[PDB]
Amino acid sequence: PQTTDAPAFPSNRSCPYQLPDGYAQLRDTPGPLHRVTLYDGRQAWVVTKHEAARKLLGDPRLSSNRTDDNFPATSPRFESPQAFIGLDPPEHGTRRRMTISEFTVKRIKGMRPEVEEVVHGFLDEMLAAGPTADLVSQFALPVPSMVICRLLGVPYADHEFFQDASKRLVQSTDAQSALTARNDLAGYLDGLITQFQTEPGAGLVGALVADQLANGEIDREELISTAMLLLIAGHETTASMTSLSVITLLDHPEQYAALRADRSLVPGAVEELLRYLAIADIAGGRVATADIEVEGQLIRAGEGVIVVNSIANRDGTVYEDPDALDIHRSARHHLAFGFGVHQCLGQNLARLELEVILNALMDRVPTLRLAVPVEQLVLRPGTTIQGVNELPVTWHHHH
């Protein structure tokens, strides 16, 4: 028999919003941990339950150091200084604190008018041209790209270049392709730094150049890695939430109608979509630097551990009928953004963008529908951020 106690991980979605069959099996199997086999044949642990996931994300013995030989790499792509997503305290905090000013609740509130303007501008163009359109290239991707560009001080004129490079890095299936894409972005950002040294400019990259870099408090290549992380996360991840949210909501028309009828439900719907779609398991990897006993299971020093937030988010002890989309439920404490010192820097920018986008789509494109069957969509594999790379849509064309 072929039966194993260490199934291949990750699994690929066959429905944009449903747990892969293999993940349902992991979810249903008692205990916080399960053994899996990664692409290169190495065994690692996955964390599959909600409280255990929080506990392990909060445990400093589970390091975020991606340079470690034993870090649980899920694809050949995983093969330069790390941005703070790959650092542990105390280094993590010194670098993260260089960027937090741009993501405060006050700044996010100040960004609302800008986000609304950007969203409506891309809708103007799309709706003027008429259906059909690919929602990804025409809306889902450009909106957060334009927003993160202004936040960073990266000129939006270079969007085609950096969007292509970002996709190649995030979705590469080989190390060579990933490395070329990273090199492309690094060289670009290094040029921007030099330009800011000549002519001080706006945006987070400008601020880091004028202050921390000028004071020797961040290495030039660390600034490059940090800007790269924010550029990629700031547009690729939110774009995927948009497209997958549209697909999901169109497959749940009663809930979508209820949402349209009472816009005060939108923040809660955003939480539920984040919980339900949980697009970022690829950011759950950890390596143990010491032995950790977990409800009788032993993680040994040097073992890889992946905190699979998508499965933790379907823990029925926390979310009653966990596989049911319910925009009125308490989706409080979901792990779609992680938990603890590394909890997503951009989480509230993501929440703002999704709220503005859903309200705009309901206002201006109430007749929006998919232009192809859901089954015909091509879903990204579990080795990258979840999503679709194309989303054909149509609507009632008003002249």
Binding site feature residues for calciol: 74, 182, 225, 282
Q: How far is the CB of 85 from ligand HEM (least distance, A)?
A: 4
Query: Does 141 sit near ligand HEM (CB under 6 A)?
Result: no
Query: Does 310 sit near ligand HEM (CB under 6 A)?
Result: no
Query: Does 52 sit near ligand HEM (CB under 6 A)?
Result: no
> Which of 283, 365, 368, 393: binder of ligand HEM (CB under 6 A)?
283
> 304-307 and 43-47 as β-strands: parallel, antiparallel, unpaired?
parallel
Query: Does 280 sit near ligand HEM (CB under 6 A)?
Result: yes
Query: Does 153 sit near ligand HEM (CB under 6 A)?
Result: no
The interface mask with ligand HEM, positions 348-377, x = CB under 6 A, is -xx---------------------------
Nearer to ligand HEM, 238 or 383 (CB): 238
Residue 107's nearest CA partner among 188, 185, 189, 207 is 207
> Which of 237, 242, 243, 386: binder of ligand HEM (CB under 6 A)?
237
Please give the backbone phi and psi of residue 214, each rounded to the nearest 5 degrees, phi first.
Answer: -60, -25
- How many angstroms separate the first and last alpha carbons of the chain? 63
Annotated binding site: 74, 92, 96, 182, 225, 282, 286, 342, 344
Residue, CB closest to ligand HEM: 346
- Distance between CA 344 and CA 108 in Å, rounded? 14
Query: Does 53 sit near ligand HEM (CB under 6 A)?
Result: no
Q: Distance from CA of residue 365 to its chain's centroid?
A: 26
The DSSP code for 82 is P
Which 197-236 positions form the footprint of ligand HEM (CB under 6 A)? 229-230, 233-234
Angle at 241 between CA 239 and CA 243, to 5 degrees: 70
Annotated binding site for heme: 92, 96, 286, 342, 344
Query: Does 169 sit near ligand HEM (CB under 6 A)?
Result: no
Cis peptide before 10 (omega within 30 of 0): yes
Nearer to ligand HEM, 277 or 294 (CB): 277
Which 61-90 positions form the footprint of ligand HEM (CB under 6 A)? 64, 84-85
Contact 246, 391 (CB under 8 A): yes
Contact 171, 274 (CB under 8 A): no
Q: How far is the CB of 332 from ligand HEM (least distance, A)?
A: 16
Contacting residues for 147 by C-beta, under 8 A, at least 6 apart: 111, 114, 115, 118, 234, 235, 349, 353
Contacting residues for 30 by C-beta, under 8 A, at least 6 apart: none
Please give the backbone phi and psi of residue 11, each rounded to the nearest 5 degrees, phi first.
Answer: -105, 160
Q: How far is the CB of 165 from ligand HEM (least distance, A)?
A: 17
Burial of residue 215 (CB within 10 Å: 0-12, 13-18, 19+) is exposed
- Distance between CA 387 and CA 237 in Å, rounded? 9
> Which of 338, 368, 386, 393: binder of ligand HEM (CB under 6 A)?
338
Q: How far is the CB of 84 from ligand HEM (least distance, A)?
A: 5
CA dihedral 324, 385, 106, 226 (to 10 degrees): 160
Please give the backbone phi and psi of residue 315, each rounded to the nearest 5 degrees, phi first.
Answer: -80, 110
Which one of 107-115, 315-323, 336-344, 360-368 is the stretch in contact with ligand HEM (CB under 6 A)? 336-344
User: How many residues interact with ligand HEM (rule CB under 6 A)?
Assistant: 24
> Which of 48, 212, 225, 238: binder of ligand HEM (CB under 6 A)?
238
Query: Does 145 sit near ligand HEM (CB under 6 A)?
Result: no
Q: How far is the CB of 166 from ligand HEM (least distance, A)?
A: 12
Residues that bind ligand HEM (CB under 6 A): 64, 84-85, 96, 229-230, 233-234, 237-238, 241, 279-280, 283, 309, 336-338, 342, 344-346, 349-350
